[PDB]
């Protein structure tokens, strides 16, 4: 890389120190520039074309400083699916925002439906215990609850299914057009 | 930008987006007309077309005015 | 006096024939004796063309005219 004797010695240290490669690359650059200046300076020493010490000072100044610089949002699977598909539909931003609010209301509906199905299950557990007990008054009361709670739960079931069909069909239509 | 297309009935311009389907330029139409060729000059906001039924080449602005024979 | 042209409805329009509106409520009604989809219908929109609905669809046939009892 360098003709110069003592610049070859200095250049090895920077490899050993693993300095910043860009600064390391620039360190080669100015040393390759300096070696031309250094040989030029000495070329005057055999040519006797300097006696004022300029061509020594100018080069050692840079070298000495070089010694310093280098040391040298949804919850239900169905609404998530509908939102994911509706993202790729031909919806206007206004229709997209209205559709977002519609999925929020649909999500509230499905949460209500699953809450009442779980209530229909714990009322079924109470009904199983009562039927095993066999008390006619307990059976009559638990029926008055259960047989009407079933219809309330099922009416929500129909309404959630219809809303899901409408939303899914509208998204599928808005994906092809 | 919009999608310029030509047919026998008319020359029309529709948005590239499939949501907002309404035309964005006045549909060019003639009585015996049969349109084939189209191009545009967006600096003057004009469209060139050829009525193959008349054998005439026209130019017309986007807003529907300024029909002239080329 | 025929200024400020702008198109409201164009999608699916088939054969639009009848039209009526009630600016006091903001609905626009128009009839259509066969769409690009095939179905003839009477439909309702807002007066800006948005939020279209099949207002009548069964046994519609060839709806030719519309008026409103305001």
Curated annotation (Swiss-Prot), chain A:
Modifications the protein undergoes after translation, according to the UniProt entry: N-glycosylated.
UniProt subcellular location: Rough endoplasmic reticulum lumen; Endoplasmic reticulum-Golgi intermediate compartment lumen; Golgi apparatus, cis-Golgi network; Golgi apparatus lumen
Residues modified by glycosylation: 90
Coiled coil location: 73-121
Domain of life: Eukaryota
Region (LDL receptor binding): 73-175
Function: Molecular chaperone for LDL receptor-related proteins that may regulate their ligand binding activity along the secretory pathway.
Homology family: Belongs to the alpha-2-MRAP family.
Subunit structure, interactors included: Interacts with the LRP1/alpha-2-macroglobulin receptor heavy and light chains; the interaction is transient and coincides with a reduction of ligand binding by the receptor. Interacts with LRP2/glycoprotein 330. Interacts with LRP1B; binding is followed by internalization and degradation. Interacts with LDLR. Interacts with SORL1. Interacts with LRP1; this interaction is followed by rapid internalization.
Protein name: Alpha-2-macroglobulin receptor-associated protein
Organism encoding this protein: Rattus norvegicus
Name of encoding gene: Lrpap1
Full-sequence portion shown in this chain: 56 to 358 of 360
């Amino acid at each position: 890389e360098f003709r110069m004797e003592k610049l070859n010695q200095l250049w090895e240290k920077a490899k050993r120190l693993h300095l910043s490669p860009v600064r390391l690359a620039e360190l080669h650059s100015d040393l390759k520039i300096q070696e031309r200046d250094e040989l030029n300076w000495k070329k005057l020493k055999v040519e006797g074309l300097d006696g004022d010490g300029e061509k020594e000072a100018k080069l050692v100044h840079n070298l000495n400083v070089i010694l310093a610089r280098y040391g040298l949002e949804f919850e239900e699977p169905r609404v998530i699916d509908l939102w994911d598909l509706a993202q790729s539909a031909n919806f206007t931003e206004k229709e997209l925002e209205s559709f977002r609010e519609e999925l929020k209301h649909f999500e509230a509906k499905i949460e209500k439906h699953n809450h009442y199905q779980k209530q229909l299950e714990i009322s079924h557990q109470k009904l199983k215990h009562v039927e095993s007990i066999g008390d006619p008054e307990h059976i009559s009361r638990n029926k008055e609850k259960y047989v009407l709670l079933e219809e309330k739960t099922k009416e929500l079931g129909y309404k959630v299914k219809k809303h899901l069909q409408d939303l899914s069909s509208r998204v599928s239509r808005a994906r092809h057009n | 930008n919009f999608l310029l297309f030509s047919s026998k009935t008319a020359v029309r311009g529709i948005p590239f987006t499939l949501s907002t389907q309404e035309d964005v330029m006045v549909p060019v139409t003639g009585s015996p007309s049969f349109f084939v060729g189209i191009d545009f000059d967006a600096q003057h906001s004009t469209v060139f077309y050829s009525d193959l039924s008349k054998d005439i080449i026209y130019k017309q602005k986007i807003d529907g005015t300024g029909k002239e024979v080329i | 006096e025929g200024n400020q042209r702008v198109t409201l409805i164009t999608e699916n329009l088939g054969h639009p024939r009848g039209i009526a509106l009630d600016p006091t409520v903001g609905y626009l009604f128009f009839s259509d004796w066969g769409s690009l989809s095939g179905q003839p219908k009477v439909e309702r929109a807002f007066m800006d063309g948005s939020n279209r609905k099949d207002l009548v669809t069964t046994k519609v046939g060839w709806p030719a005219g519309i008026t409103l009892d305001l």
